[PDB]
Amino acid sequence: EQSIQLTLGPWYSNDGKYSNPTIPVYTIQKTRSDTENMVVVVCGEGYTKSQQGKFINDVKRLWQDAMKYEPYRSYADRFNVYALCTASESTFDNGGSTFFDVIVDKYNSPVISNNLHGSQWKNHIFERCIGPEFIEKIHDAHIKKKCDPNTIPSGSEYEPYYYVHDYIAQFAMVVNTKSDFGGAYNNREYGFHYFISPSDSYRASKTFAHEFGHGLLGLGDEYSNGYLLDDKELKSLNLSSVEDPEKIKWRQLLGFRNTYTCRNAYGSKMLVSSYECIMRDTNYQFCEVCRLQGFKRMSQLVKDVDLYVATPEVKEYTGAYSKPSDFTDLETSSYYNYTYNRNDRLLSGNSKSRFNTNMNGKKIELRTVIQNISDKNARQLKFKMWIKHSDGSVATDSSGNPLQTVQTFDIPVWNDKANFWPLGALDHIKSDFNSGLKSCSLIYQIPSDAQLKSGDTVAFQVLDENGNVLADDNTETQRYTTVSIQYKFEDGSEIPNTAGGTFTVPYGTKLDLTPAKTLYDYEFIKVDGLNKPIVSDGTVVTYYYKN
Ligand SMILES: [Pr+3]
Ligand SMILES: [Zn+2]
Ligand SMILES: [Zn+2]
Structure with a gap:
């Protein structure tokens, strides 16, 4: 069958239990050449040889659940996913020898333990042994191995293996266990780019998506602590300590959906763009800033994605939460007061039916954010919004003019693209959050003489230059x-x-x-x-x- 074979000397298997392992390879998804997709390699820890069918079904379950979250879902068919059936002598729960020497430390962190058996390079196994064999034999690029991983290279111990994390977008290690833990190891300068998560914990899929958010999407722990220094502020994709709403990196998203900056705990100098994000609490979805940043990150790893259109919303325009000084209070009470106000004004998604005949004379706002992925082509997108009767017809005022308005928005190029986790990068250092980014607001004054009927709702379309509908008033609640x-x-x-x-x-x-x-x-x-x-x-x- 299809397999790879490793050679693990004493630096990787000091007790000789996995000196020459044969690792069957399963393709879970291959929709395009590996050279055009993000390649994910998933290995099992604590699965005996007779448990590899459980491992494969576990990966399929976790992966399919991860693909239900935006922004992954938008890229779901642009991943190639491989399950490497690494066989442990012992199950994880029995506590004997396992392929990866994973232990759970006193902080409940899963850690590859180099000292468990004295395999001094155990936690280098992905980029020095597994990755290069995979990329030579399975990956479509077939990059020949360059260095003997059981010898010391001349010069850097790390540079010869940097190429691994450009052909393999993410290593994931799934542990055969019900124990609730998770860990992500992201330090490409020293070869580390993998995460560890359990197969059967009570929130195993949520944890997988979370650690995948750290690893692939580059997102930061929104539960973390401290005041971010200037260089760390520039570095972080989704965290901030900038209290002034006119200066915070994500200012353009403020007031869109549940984007309202707030402290991640009482008294904290660490700010998040939304209190409700999977990166702080695994019961939530990704917030709009994480969706944007993750969508941008993945766009660097494929070739044919050139635009991000966040799901638009329609809100009664009252003037609330419409200017920067409305966002100055960063307490959690201000966050929830903001989200309650949004619900009281919402006219889209599952609040479409909140429209009523008392809306004449009121203003409505179509709001979204758009990210140009191109660094060459500026974009011009046309927003259309109108009042629709229940039979689909367009409502009018008393003179017969349609209750409709249009506005075109210019999306500038992403000139800062090469600073944002491009292929080959060892880290993210600085990026201009606003490069290529445009918050778009179309405000419509419903005339006093609008001929509104029971069951009217707000319809809308975001259109590209050719009139193709990129999003509309059915997008948010559409069936998958x-x-x-x-x-x-x-x-x-x-x-x-x-x-x-x-x-x-x-x-x-x-x-x-x-x-x-x-x-x-x-x-x-x-x-x-x-x-x-x-x-x-x-x-x-x-x-x-x-x-
Ligand atoms: Pr043949
Ligand atoms: Zn975490
Ligand atoms: Zn977030």
């Missing part, structure tokens, strides 16, 4: 559909060492990806199910490869 991937030989047999996963897309989506020319050594033949609206759960897209 599950699509299943299968890999088959031309005779219909399932390809061994594949375990095709599922993800979700908006109902009606036409998938349009160029399939990879090869799967392992199998040659691509044809695909069934692409370029066709996905309109049923369990829809199967079938990739056919020559045996």
Whole structure:
């Protein structure tokens, strides 16, 4: 079957338990060449050889649950996901020898323990052993190994393995356990880019998405502490200590959805853009700043994503939370007072029906934020907003003029792009949060003589230069559909060492990806199910490869 073979000398397996392991490789998802997608490699800790089927199903479960969160969900079909069936002598719960020597320290942190058996480089195993074998043999780039990982290179111990984390976007280690923990190890200068999370804890999927947010998306722990120094302020994608709303990096997002800067705990000098974010508390979704920053980060790792359009909202425009001085109080009470006010004004998503015939003479606001991913093409997006009767017709005033307004917004280029986690970067140092970023507000005065009827709602569209609808008043609550991937030989047999996963897309989506020319050594033949609206759960897209 498909596998990689490692050579682990005493620096990686000092007790000889894994001196020459054979590691079966399973493809969970490969929708395009590895050279065009983000490659995720997932290994199991504490799974015996007879438990590798549990491991594969565990990865599929955690991965599919991660793909339900924005911003990952927008990129769901642009990941290639591989499960490496690393076999431990002992299960994790039995407490004997495991592949990765993971221990849970006194702070409940899962840690690769170099000193457990004296394997002095154990926590370098991903970039020095697993990664380079994978990239030479499985990855479509087939980059030949450059250094013997069981010898000391001339010069830097680390530089020869930097290339690993450009071909493998993320290493994840799933522990076969119910224990609730999580850890992320992000220090590319010293080779570290992996996270560790449990298979069966009560919030295992939430933890996975969270540690994935640290690792791939570059997001900071919103539960952390302290006053950020100037260099750390520039460095952080989603944390701040800047109290002045006119200077805070994410000022353009203030007042959009639940973006209202606030202290992450009473008295804290550490500020978050939203109190309700998975990066502070794993029960939440990603906040709008994390969604933006993660969407930008992933755009650096693929080639064909050029625009981010946050989901627009419509709010009664009262003047509240409309200027910087409305955001100066950073207490949690101010955050929740802001979110209550938003709910009292909301006219979109699940509050569409709050529109009523008393809205004549009132102002409404269409609000979103837009990020240009291009550093070459400025963009011009047209917003349209109108009052729609329940039968779909456009409402009018008493003179017959449609209750409709339009405004075009100019989105400047992302000239700062090369400073924001580009391919090859060892870290993020400084970026201009506002480069390529435009908060867009379209305010409409509903006429006093508006001919409103019961059941009227606000409709809207964000349009590109060709009139294509990028978002509309149905986007937020639209139905998502599950699509299943299968890999088959031309005779219909399932390809061994594949375990095709599922993800979700908006109902009606036409998938349009160029399939990879090869799967392992199998040659691509044809695909069934692409370029066709996905309109049923369990829809199967079938990739056919020559045996
Ligand atoms: Pr052959
Ligand atoms: Zn955490
Ligand atoms: Zn966040």
